[PDB]
Design a protein around this ligand. Structure first.
Ligand code: HEM
Ligand code: MWM
Length: 137
């Protein structure tokens, strides 16, 4: 289930983080409005860019802690508040997060592994709800 999936992702997190983020950028190319340094680069070129690997790992590091602190795929209000109030998230809306979770769920469904894709879909929907409640537009 969901908790085992956090363990699975954490066991190879740099790789899963980059492949999920690439699945997001490739599914939703207009999302690069917020990542202008990633325009005009293939996946292998992005993996070679220091901030692509180091920021994407740090994003998934924190996402796995928010997932781990959740109860039944519902994040802590303190985690939602932190994600709204981060200066690096000043430009964002809940739709940016919805699209990331649609890509993460599609990636899990396409894998041969017994990921609990239904739980990740609920987590993404519950995180969006919590971000809205904490004041993200
Ligand atoms: C649960 C989901 C997310 C978590 C846990 C999270 C966490 C983080 C963290 C920890 C950073 C700091 C990275 C660093 O400076 O090394 C960061 C930066 C940033 N995050 Fe988020 N984030 C999430 C979702 C998103 C989404 C969906 C977007 C946009 C589609 C976004 C846009 C950014 C941007 C633009 C930065 C700064 C630019 C950059 O770091 O390259 N984040 N986030
Ligand atoms: C900055 C960032 C945001 C995400 F949502 C995914 C990967 C990243 O490097």
């Amino acid at each position: 289930g969901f908790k085992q999936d956090i363990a699975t992702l954490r066991g190879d997190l740099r790789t899963y983080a980059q492949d999920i983020f690439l699945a997001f950028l490739n599914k939703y190319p207009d999302e690069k409005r917020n990542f202008k340094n990633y325009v005009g680069k293939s996946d292998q070129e992005l993996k070679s860019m220091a901030k692509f690997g180091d920021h994407t790992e740090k994003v998934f590091n924190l996402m796995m802690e928010v997932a781990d602190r959740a109860t039944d795929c519902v994040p802590l209000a303190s985690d939602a508040s932190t994600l709204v109030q981060m200066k690096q998230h000043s430009g964002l809306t809940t739709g940016n997060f919805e699209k990331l979770f649609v890509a993460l769920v599609e990636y899990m469904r396409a894998s041969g592994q017994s990921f609990d894709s239904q739980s990740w879909d609920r987590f993404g929907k519950n995180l969006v709800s919590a971000l809205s409640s904490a004041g993200m537009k």
